[PDB]
Amino acid sequence: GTILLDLAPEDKEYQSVEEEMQSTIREHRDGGNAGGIFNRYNVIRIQKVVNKKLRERFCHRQKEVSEENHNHHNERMLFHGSPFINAIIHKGFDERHAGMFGAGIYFAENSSKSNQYVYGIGGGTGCPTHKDRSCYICHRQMLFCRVTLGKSFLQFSTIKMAHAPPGHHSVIGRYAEYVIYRGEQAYPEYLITYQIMKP
Ligand SMILES: CN(C)CC(=O)Nc1ccc2[nH]c(=O)c3ccccc3c2c1
Ligand SMILES: CN(C)CC(=O)Nc1ccc2[nH]c(=O)c3ccccc3c2c1
Ligand SMILES: [Zn+2]
Structure with missing residues (x-):
């Protein structure tokens, strides 16, 4: 089962994660309709997801991806926002639940892009209350994930793909959207509990 390790604010790791989240807020085309209006977050807590089965699957896939990618994982830390975080942290990512670049699981370099998905597509109906x-x-939650991109395929138009193109492990679609077609290519490393803050 999943254990959550509570990072202390004094930890360098907590600070690194928070700074990645704070520095990547951007203005979105929808003018804040989906994710809300804010210039910063109030980070309530940062937790590390430890799950032996999820780590084993991620490690097993990493090695396979490595052999087809000049012995490189091409791992990147990326944000993911979802109303299904609870399922993700216990069961792992699952592509069977999956778009602009087709049936994959989408990650962003910008925390504010992932914040637009926390309550659903287009921000859904917002918060429950x-x-x-x-x-x-x-309080909102988002993930800061370890994502095995391997050999990325660069896409510049909308395409409904089922899987990464032959010899490729991910799609970088065009701001860039990072797309994987196999759940075991992402590990939900950090669980961030936060609020957006009124400017
Ligand atoms: C068919 N689409 C309406 C489904 C969809 O867009 N699902 C989905 C669902 C969750 C998403 N979460 C993200 O963090 C994200 C980051 C960059 C780009 C997209 C996403 C993202 C996308
Ligand atoms: C009936 N459904 C609205 C429930 C559902 O979709 N649950 C659910 C449950 C687990 C999910 N896990 C994922 O990794 C994921 C990735 C991209 C998009 C969705 C999911 C995901 C979705
Ligand atoms: Zn509310």
């Missing part, structure tokens, strides 16, 4: 996509009260 206030039905507010820009809620400053309710």
